């Protein structure tokens, strides 16, 4: 269906311990495919998916030169930003940047985004129209003016509607086996006594891709959204995901309860009875 490519840059200062730590990482949908680490002895943009390894040396040569340049701008940014908020020299600080593009079912450009953050909070963001900025805070307006003056939004838009989308489409073709195919969730229910009058019913979903999923519990067809405990959807490590949802049930009524799984891998939404 719809798809996305995104890059996540993270730089963190190391006061009195040398140069900042830069980590870049690249995703298509919920699948990572590249990364760069300034602390890695490699000193190269490395692959983290099979379907990108087939790209030529020009790609790896170039991507590396670019990612190095990215880190160096963020390095300066850490200094400028400390000045903008006027902080001491002791204490580590963090800059993050997230950008990329979305495509529809038709693989045509849908949305572009570009966000910056200082010490965990929104700093500046490019708006939907890819023409104007959102200088959240005060100091951010300084940056906003520089970036308006240097027409940054125009070259970003150019990238987001141009090479971003075009290369996402290319990646989707090269990685067809991985990226365009779904892994339906493997499901099961477990039972644990809380007391002698209460028991937990847990609904599981394992080995599923993509990470998007919905697990809900129902008592006699009616949704139990309030007493349900969800866990953060977590990675299996093999490229699939896991999630469970649980409810507390009165002992001897488990049979009234059903679990409803929703996912692209499933042709139709699964309904799981505790007692068939």
């Amino acid at each position: 269906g719809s798809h996305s490519m995104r890059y996540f840059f993270t730089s963190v200062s190391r006061p009195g311990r040398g140069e900042p730590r830069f980590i870049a990482v690249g995703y298509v949908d919920d699948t990572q495919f590249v990364r760069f680490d300034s602390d890695a002895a490699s000193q190269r943009m490395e692959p983290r998916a099979p379907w990108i390894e087939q790209e030529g040396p020009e790609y790896w040569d170039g991507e590396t030169r670019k990612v190095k340049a990215h880190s160096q701008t963020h390095r300066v940014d850490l200094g400028t930003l400390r000045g903008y908020y006027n902080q001491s020299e002791a204490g580590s600080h963090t800059v993050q940047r997230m950008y990329g593009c979305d495509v529809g079912s038709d693989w045509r450009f849908l949305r572009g985004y570009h966000q910056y953050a200082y010490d965990g909070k929104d700093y500046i963001a490019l708006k939907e129209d890819l023409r104007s900025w959102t200088a959240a805070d005060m100091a951010a307006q300084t940056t906003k003016h520089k970036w308006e003056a240097a027409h940054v939004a125009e070259q970003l838009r150019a990238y987001l509607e141009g090479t971003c989308v075009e290369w996402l489409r290319r990646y989707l073709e090269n990685g067809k086996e991985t990226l365009q195919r779904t892994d339906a969730p493997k499901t099961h229910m477990t039972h644990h006594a809380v007391s002698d009058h209460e028991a937990t019913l847990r609904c599981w979903a394992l080995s599923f891709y993509p990470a998007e999923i919905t697990l809900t519990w129902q008592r006699d067809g009616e949704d139990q959204t309030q007493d349900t405990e969800l866990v953060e959807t977590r990675p299996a490590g093999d490229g699939t995901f896991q999630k469970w949802a649980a409810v507390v049930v009165p002992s001897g009524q488990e049979q009234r309860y059903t679990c409803h799984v929703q996912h692209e891998g499933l042709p139709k939404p699964l309904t799981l009875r505790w007692e068939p």
Binding site: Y59, H70, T73, T80, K146
Partner: peptide, 9 residues
């Protein structure tokens, strides 16, 4: 593929 180096803040 990465965008080209972006301006300082």
């Amino acid at each position: 593929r990465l965008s080209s180096p972006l301006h300082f803040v």
